[PDB]
Design a protein around this ligand. Structure first.
Ligand SMILES: CCCCCCCCCCCCCCCCCC(=O)OC[C@H](COP(=O)([O-])OCC(O)COP(=O)([O-])OC[C@@H](COC(=O)CCCCCCCCCCCCCCCCC)OC(=O)CCCCCCCCCCCCCCCCC)OC(=O)CCCCCCCCCCCCCCCCC
Ligand SMILES: CCCCCCCCCCCCCCCCCC(=O)OC[C@H](COP(=O)([O-])OCC(O)COP(=O)([O-])OC[C@@H](COC(=O)CCCCCCCCCCCCCCCCC)OC(=O)CCCCCCCCCCCCCCCCC)OC(=O)CCCCCCCCCCCCCCCCC
Ligand SMILES: CCCCCCCCCCCCCCCCCC(=O)OC[C@H](COP(=O)([O-])OCC(O)COP(=O)([O-])OC[C@@H](COC(=O)CCCCCCCCCCCCCCCCC)OC(=O)CCCCCCCCCCCCCCCCC)OC(=O)CCCCCCCCCCCCCCCCC
Ligand SMILES: CCCCCCCCCCCCCCCCCC(=O)OC[C@H](COP(=O)(O)OCCN)OC(=O)CCCCCCCCCCCCCCCCC
Ligand SMILES: CCCCCCCCCCCCCCCCCC(=O)OC[C@H](COP(=O)(O)OCCN)OC(=O)CCCCCCCCCCCCCCCCC
Ligand SMILES: Nc1ncnc2c1ncn2[C@@H]1O[C@H](COP(=O)(O)OP(=O)(O)O)[C@@H](O)[C@H]1O
Lengths: 139, 120, 96, 155, 344, 103, 318, 54
């Protein structure tokens, strides 16, 4: 776990390699989990068919992970701005686009771009403003 | 929260300590609301059971307006206590642990420079 | 000691079982019971090496409640192979 | 043989493994019987007698007996071999895991009152009748209700 | 049911939650849970229709394995602390088990699959008990142990439930299942504030009970398990159309009605505790719940669906009345908001 | 607990037997009875939030009477290294390990 | 009547006697069953229920004065005959209302049987209604789905009620009935295509009679046996009420059945199921008007006992 | 821009987005095995959520 966290430690826009790798893993992990629920429920017809679906979901998710990581990191270096939430939006923007492609739908890319990017941007803001998620009870 | 307080009455409704608090005036708007809340329950019942809405169960209407209200005085009497305990508890702590709640002294405006953002 | 980790994993292996049906309701009702045995054994074991005699009542209360629990479970099972001629779970898919 | 305890635990684990594989309901019942036997053994190993007996006269007794009865009625159709194979697969994996800590009966009967006269299993559970008198009332109500639940659910 | 049996069962279904609540020895809390499991199964199969046996056999297996997991937590604690009850020291995994298990009996979040299906095959009446007098027991166990449970998991199960409940409800047209789905959702809010202010869980429950109990006795007054069935309410009994309208919008959070308070104070408490991330997302999809509530509103009240001639016949005959509880629980529920300060 | 119908009614059907140091049948004290007392008369009047830091000496000890793991550890080490000393023929059990003794 | 009453006595078990049975007499459009019924009734004091009518429910409820046609579902047997295969489908609406009417009649009959203990002769019953629909579908009168909708209502409601103890039956060949029609002259009843009468009896003969034979006592009578209530009555008193589902009706089982018939709103709960076949549909605008108008009739605007128009008093304390 | 583009983007899209979710989330076999394993997955993830955030 010390791993994933690393993504945040080094300043954004720097060491994109590690960023993309980490982002790709998270997506892939989600892919596995997502495929699992998708196979446990709404099962397949043959073991192979399901192994394929696991692969499909895993790769698609890994891809959205990569492009998000790559776009955000690169957008940063190029723009010479490491804390501009927009960076992430461009990244989320891209991530959605990959999802759209893997689903072969321009429309999905639309919703995907806006919704996904917005979400990622909010993550950046969240980190920038020190928003706390799942907080301990401090009343 | 307020449970676990010293002296807590394990299953009592309103500990006698609540005697010290003023009793709720019977016409307290709230108890009067409960009354109206009640009359309406009564009227509603008549309606759902298809009876003349207002001219029926004039005995029930009374049971309702008088059950809800009865409940109120004795509930409000308590909720009032609970809130009163909350201060007793809150104010006390502010003192017993004074340093944590220190009386700060603000400066007058003459000294405070507040930023001016020109609308223009 | 380790004795406890075997029993605990026995309960998890029995856990993995009840949560993965294999077309036999009876078998499940039988796996479910494998847990109760593992719980009964573990409760009895620690109570015995803690010399906590005040608690031995529990090891048995666990079994008494578990037995009836199973009685109910089997009556449902008999009810099912009276309505569908089998205990097979697939049949239980009307509530979709 | 200090390993005696570990040996038993392993057997128990293996038996539950079989039940886990969900063999024929009858095979499952048989497996549990073996495990229950192992179980009473372990409990007795610690020193508890009455306790060990119970599982025997309750599980090795009717608990599986009715199951058995039951299965005869609702289980008609007999890969068990494959299941047996996976069982061996699990056994070695189980063994492998213990061998993992291998590279990396010492303390039982942790404490005992060498001289004692009224200590023994069952005495504590005998206190269901005195100073624990709420366990057995609730258990009795459980049985007295269970009668009714089963009679209607069968009805 | 031989009235004697009816008594024994009903007593158990009622001794079941009460033992849980009263006792402190967890064991005695477990058997309280066990008795509830045994008592509910007979009533569930009263019609003994093929759907029913399916319902009970699912409810029972889901309930039984969760019961066994709760017992394992108590058995493990007994070794990590001689006590038969969770303490500050309790291993975190020990408590998390209890959360998952108890969240299965209550049916929250990723374990929300059994409830909608058992709510679909049981009568409307036993539906209420299965939804509201069987949630009191497990919640009691959680509320008692709140200081110790994890804020992260609860929140995840909370948010998930809200979403699953909402999304599930949108598609459903069977009423029993619309309610099952709502209960999953409300149950979610309740478990969200448990780690922070248990006292509010007990409000978000009562209000749910004072809202759902009138709503179901409404569904059964005409015994309509279909929206199409509840839509012809205007012909079968016109008066309940007004309150059915407000109670359902009250079940969702719309501001004038009593239903806003639980969501409002839960949001106030979560923001007081700084979860302005979590609280925001919950409130937003909470708005999805009202959409399916209002879609039903449309069919039952705001628009009059066509009815059947044979209905004129049912009008003729005197309609067996709705119990008084409906009224007292419809009004105290649709409009108590002016009295919120005391409620909390 | 959630509804204390027990304290109110004064009955004690569920409290008398929640910890090891509670009355044992025939007055036969259970194991560890020396610590749990010391760890609950300490945490009495002090709530949990403060029964978890300052009354940590008594739980760290009671966590060792029962689990008795540090002992296991120490002893296990003694065993392993003794094996190494025997390995170097440095040590072998004396008649102390095996000899006659008082009643 | 409720568990409370049942718990303390009030058991149908203590109120049943040999003469206490559900006996229906079914025949063609004119089997003289009306006559046989009254007599059998007179014989054992059986409450003789009249055949179910369009306004039987209105006579059942409140004042009992006949309702306006549109208030009673706008059904005409008269129009049934003069306009078969009508565009508006009055014939199916007539049949569906008839099934609801006998459902009310059968339930009222069962309530009298379990409370009083007296038996009941109900002439035609829900059990013997299908023959009209079978003949109507065999003819152009009703279309296939229409049939399915009636069958669905029948399957949903009829099983709950216990079967007729015995089902006295008359038979008079189609020629006979047509001729019998001519004697009581009515333009509408007169124009009933024989084949349709052929289809009605055929169903009893083939479907209804053997169906119930296994379930209840079946006494078929030739016209000659008929018109001799004494003989038929004698035979009923002769048959042994053994075979049938009635054997298992213990007191604790009857209680629930009683509480059903005791609630008319439930008896026909499934008669109003929201299946939208076009003939059955009220329609919201027409249905709302008919309701505002049926609900405004004196004594109907409020529950029985509370409407002052008809002279109810004490409303302010009820 | 009125009608189609400003109705397809904000009002209609949000209409479409969620309906898909319910359809995918609510298309369930109804079989117990499937549902249950999902319980398995959950236990696994929660076990981890605790593990990694130990
Ligand atoms: C920790 C504990 C966690 C517990 C979690 C428990 C989850 C339980 C879920 C309910 C049970 C499972 C179930 O009901 O099955 C539904 C569903 C059934 O799938 P299926 O019917 O087998 O699929 C057939 C077709 O492939 C389906 O057609 P398709 O996939 O070709 O088209 C659908 C597609 C079409 O796309 C769209 O048009 C909508 C796009 C919306 C984008 C929103 C982006 C928001 C980003 C926020 C950050 O929708 C999407 O792909 C949405 C993608 C959103 C990506 C968000 C970023 C990641 O299973 C899943 O979709 C995955 C379930 C597990 C989800 C795990 C968590 C999510 C991450 C992995 C995915
Ligand atoms: C009824 C007609 C009047 C009957 C009079 C009966 C005899 C009597 O006691 O009158 C003298 C008595 C003399 O009172 P007072 O001690 O001179 O009170 C002077 C205070 O300045 C006035 O007292 P206050 O205003 O400080 O009362 C405390 C509290 C009292 O609480 C309330 O009464 C709230 C009433 C909200 C309506 O006020 C509030 O709760 C403030 C929030 C109010 C808004 C809450 C939400 C509003 C919308 C809720 C809609 C619910 C239905 C939705 C349906 C869909 O008048 C009353 O207290 C009752 C007046 C009517 C109250 C509402 C009854 C319904
Ligand atoms: C944010 C809030 C928004 C509120 C509005 C929106 C929310 C509520 C919407 C309600 C409607 C939603 C749509 C429902 C379906 C509509 C279509 C339909 O199918 O209706 C058929 C349905 C057929 O029923 P029906 O057989 O004609 O029943 C006759 C009615 O009961 C009528 O009987 P009647 O007129 O022959 O009898 C006269 C009686 C009528 O009685 C009622 O109907 C009462 C209904 C209460 C409903 C409360 C709802 C909240 O007059 C009285 O109310 C009692 C007057 C004497 C006692 C006064 C007590 C002191 C009052 C002091 C002032 C109170 C206000 C200020 C507070 C105090 C000072 C601070 O039409 C209705 O009756 C609707 C009843 C509910 C009306 C609620 C109006 C609330 C206005 C606010
Ligand atoms: C299904 C099965 C359901 C069974 C339900 C059983 C419910 C009660 C179970 C516990 C009963 C305990 C009875 C104790 C009686 C007792 O202690 O006797 C002493 C005293 C007078 O009795 P004594 O003078 O000895 O006369 C006897 C002559 N042979 O008697 C007394 O004055 C009262 C003594 C009270 C002792 C403490 C009881 C605390 C609560 C015990 C659990 C029961 C809680 C309520 C249920
Ligand atoms: C910045 C401005 C943002 C404005 C957002 C507006 C959201 C609502 C726009 C209109 C949505 C809508 O019309 O939903 C219709 C859709 C299908 O509904 P339908 O099956 O036709 O049944 C309804 C009765 N005819 O119903 C659906 O399937 C759900 C559509 C969304 C419902 C509201 C979602 C709110 C989400 C909050 C988070
Ligand atoms: N399903 C039905 N459809 C049309 N008419 C019916 C139906 N059931 C009963 N009837 C009417 O009932 C009448 C019975 O004939 P009637 O001579 O009045 O009594 P009985 O049948 O005892 O001789 C018939 O004229 C017939 O029109």
């Amino acid at each position: 776990k010390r791993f994933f966290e690393s993504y945040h430690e080094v300043p954004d826009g720097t060491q994109c390699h590690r960023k993309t790798y980490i982002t790709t893993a998270l997506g892939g992990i989600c892919g596995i989990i997502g495929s699992a629920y998708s196979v446990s429920l709404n099962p397949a017809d043959s073991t192979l068919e399901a192994v394929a679906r696991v692969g499909r979901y895993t790769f698609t998710a890994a891809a959205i992970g990569a492009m998000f990581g790559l776009t955000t990191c690169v957008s940063a270096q190029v723009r010479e701005k490491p804390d501009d939430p927009l960076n992430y939006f461009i990244g989320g923007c891209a991530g959605g686009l990959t999802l759209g492609a893997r689903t072969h739908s321009y429309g999905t890319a639309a919703m995907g771009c806006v919704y996904m990017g917005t979400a990622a941007a909010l993550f950046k803001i969240g980190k920038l403003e020190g928003w706390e998620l799942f907080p301990t009870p401090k009343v | 929260m307020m449970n676990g307080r010293p002296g807590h009455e394990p299953l009592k409704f309103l500990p006698d300590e609540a005697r010290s608090l003023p009793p709720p005036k019977l016409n307290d708007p709230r108890l009067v609301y409960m009354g109206l809340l009640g009359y309406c329950t009564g009227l509603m019942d008549n309606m759902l059971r298809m009876r003349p809405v207002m001219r029926a169960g004039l005995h029930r209407q009374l049971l309702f307006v008088t059950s809800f209200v009865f409940a109120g005085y004795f509930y409000l009497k308590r909720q009032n206590y609970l809130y009163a305990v909350k201060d007793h508890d809150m104010f006390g702590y502010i003192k017993l642990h004074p340093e944590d709640f220190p009386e700060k002294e603000k400066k007058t405006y003459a000294e405070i420079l507040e930023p001016f953002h020109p609308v223009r | 000691p380790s004795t406890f980790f075997n029993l605990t994993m026995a309960f998890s292996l029995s856990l993995l079982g009840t949560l993965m049906f294999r077309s036999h309701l009876m078998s499940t009702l039988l796996c479910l019971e494998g847990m109760v045995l593992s719980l009964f054994i573990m409760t009895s074991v620690t109570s015995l090496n803690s010399n906590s005699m005040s608690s031995m009542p529990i090891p048995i209360t666990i079994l008494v409640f578990a037995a009836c629990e199973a009685a109910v479970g089997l009556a449902l099972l008999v009810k099912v192979s009276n309505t569908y001629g089998t205990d097979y779970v697939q049949n239980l898919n009307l509530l979709q | 043989m200090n390993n005696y305890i570990f040996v038993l635990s392993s057997l128990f684990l293996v038996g539950c493994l079989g039940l886990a594989l969900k063999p024929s309901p009858i095979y499952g019942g048989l497996g549990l019987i073996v495990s229950g036997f192992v179980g009473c053994l372990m409990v007795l190993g610690f020193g508890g007698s009455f306790l060990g007996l119970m599982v025997f006269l309750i599980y090795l007794g009717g608990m599986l007996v009715v199951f058995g009865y039951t299965t005869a009625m609702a289980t008609e159709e007999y890969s068990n071999w494959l299941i047996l194979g996976f069982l061996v697969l699990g056994v070695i994996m189980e063994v492998f895991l213990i061998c993992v800590l291998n590279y990396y009966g010492d303390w039982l009967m942790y404490e005992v009152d060498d001289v004692g006269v009224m200590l023994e299993g069952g005495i504590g559970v005998a206190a269901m009748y005195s100073c624990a008198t709420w366990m057995m009332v609730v258990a009795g109500w459980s049985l007295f209700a269970g009668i009714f639940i089963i009679i209607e659910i069968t009805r | 049911m031989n009235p004697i049996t009816l008594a024994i069962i009903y007593f158990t279904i009622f001794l079941g939650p009460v033992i849980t609540m009263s006792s402190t020895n967890l064991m005695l809390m477990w058997v309280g849970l066990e008795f509830s499991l045994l008592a509910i199964i007979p009533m569930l199969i009263n019609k003994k229709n093929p759907r029913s046996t399916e319902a009970a056999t699912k409810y029972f297996v889901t309930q039984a394995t969760a019961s066994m997991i709760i017992l394992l937590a108590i058995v493990l604690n007994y070794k990590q602390l001689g006590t038969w009850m969770f303490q500050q020291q309790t291993n975190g995994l020990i408590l998390n088990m209890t959360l998952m298990a108890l969240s299965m009996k209550l049916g929250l979040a990723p374990f929300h699959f059994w409830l909608p299906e058992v709510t679909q095959g049981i009568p409307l009446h036993m539906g209420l008990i299965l939804l509201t007098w069987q949630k009191i027991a497990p919640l009691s166990i959680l509320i008692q142990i709140y200081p110790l449970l994890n804020s992260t998991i609860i929140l995840m199960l909370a948010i998930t439930s809200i979403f699953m409940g909402a999304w599930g409800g949108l598609n459903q047209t069977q009423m029993r299942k619309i309610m099952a789905y709502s209960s999953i959702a409300h149950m979610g809010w309740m478990l969200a504030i448990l780690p922070y202010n248990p006292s509010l869980t007990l409000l978000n429950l009562m209000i749910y009970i004072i809202l759902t109990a009138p709503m179901f006795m409404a569904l059964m007054l005409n015994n309509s398990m279909t929206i199409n069935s509840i839509s012809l309410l205007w012909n079968k009994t016109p008066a309940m159309l007004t309150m059915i309208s407000l109670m359902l919008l009250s079940l969702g959070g719309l501001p004038p009605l009593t239903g806003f308070l639980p969501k409002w104070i839960i949001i106030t408490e979560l923001m007081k505790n700084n979860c302005l991330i979590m609280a925001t997302l919950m409130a937003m999809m909470a708005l999805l719940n009202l959409f399916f509530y209002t879609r039903l509103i449309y069919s039952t009240s705001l628009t009059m669906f066509p009815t059947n001639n044979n209905s004129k016949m049912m009008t003729h005959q005197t309609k067996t009345k709705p119990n008084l509880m409906f009224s007292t629980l419809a009004i105290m529920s649709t409009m108590t908001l002016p009295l919120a300060p005391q409620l909390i | 607990p959630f509804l204390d119908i027990q304290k109110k009614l004064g009955i004690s059907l569920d409290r008398h037997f929640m910890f090891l140091s509670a009355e044992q049948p025939y007055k036969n004290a259970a194991r560890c009875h020396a610590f749990e007392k010391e760890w609950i008369e300490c945490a009495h009047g002090i709530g949990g939030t403060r029964a978890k830091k300052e009354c940590k000496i008594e739980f760290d000890d009671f966590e060792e009477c029962l689990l008795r793991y540090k002992t296991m550890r120490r002893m296990h080490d003694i065993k392993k290294q003794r094996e190494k000393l025997m390995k170097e023929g440095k040590y072998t059990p004396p008649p102390h390990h095996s000899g006659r003794e008082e009643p | 009547y409720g568990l409370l009453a049942a718990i303390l006595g009030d058991k149908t078990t203590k109120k049943l006697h040999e003469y206490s049975r559900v006996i229906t007499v079914d025949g063609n459009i004119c089997s003289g069953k009306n006559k046989l019924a009254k007599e059998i009734a007179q014989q054992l004091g059986m409450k003789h229920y009249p055949e179910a009518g369009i306004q039987y429910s209105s006579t059942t409820t409140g004042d009992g004065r006949p309702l306006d046609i549109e208030f009673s579902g706008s059904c005409s047997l008269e129009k049934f005959y003069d306009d078969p295969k009508s565009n508006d489908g009055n014939s199916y609406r007539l049949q569906s209302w008839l099934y609801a009417s006998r459902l009310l009649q059968y339930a009222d009959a069962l309530e009298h049987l379990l409370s009083t203990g007296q038996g009941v002769v109900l002439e035609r019953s829900i059990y013997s209604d299908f023959v009209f629909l079978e003949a109507m579908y065999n003819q152009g009168y009703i279309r296939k789905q229409c049939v399915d909708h009636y069958n669905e209502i029948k399957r949903l409601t009829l099983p709950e009620y216990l079967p007729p103890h015995a089902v006295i039956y008359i038979d008079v060949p189609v020629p006979e009935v047509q001729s019998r029609i001519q004697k009581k002259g009515d333009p509408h009843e007169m124009k009933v295509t024989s084949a349709y009468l052929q289809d009605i009896e055929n169903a009893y003969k083939k479907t209804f009679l053997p169906k119930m034979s296994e379930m209840c006592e079946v006494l078929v009578y030739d016209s000659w046996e008929a018109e001799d209530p004494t003989k038929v009555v004698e035979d009923i008193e002769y048959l042994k009420y053994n075979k049938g589902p009635w054997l298992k009706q213990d007191d604790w089982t009857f209680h629930y059945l009683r509480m059903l018939v005791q609630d008319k709103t439930e008896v026909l709960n499934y008669t109003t199921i929201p299946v939208y076949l076009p003939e059955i549909t009220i329609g919201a605008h027409q249905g709302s008007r008919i309701y505002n108008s049926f609900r405004e009739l004196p004594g109907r605007k409020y529950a029985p006992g509370y409407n002052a128009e008809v002279g109810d008093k004490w409303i302010w304390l009820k | 821009l009125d009608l189609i583009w400003l109705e397809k983007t904000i009002p209609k899209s949000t209409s479409t987005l969620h309906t898909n979710m319910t359809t995918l989330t609510t298309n369930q076999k109804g079989l117990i095995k499937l549902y249950f394993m999902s319980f398995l997955i959950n236990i696994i993830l929660i076990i981890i959520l605790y593990s990694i955030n130990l």
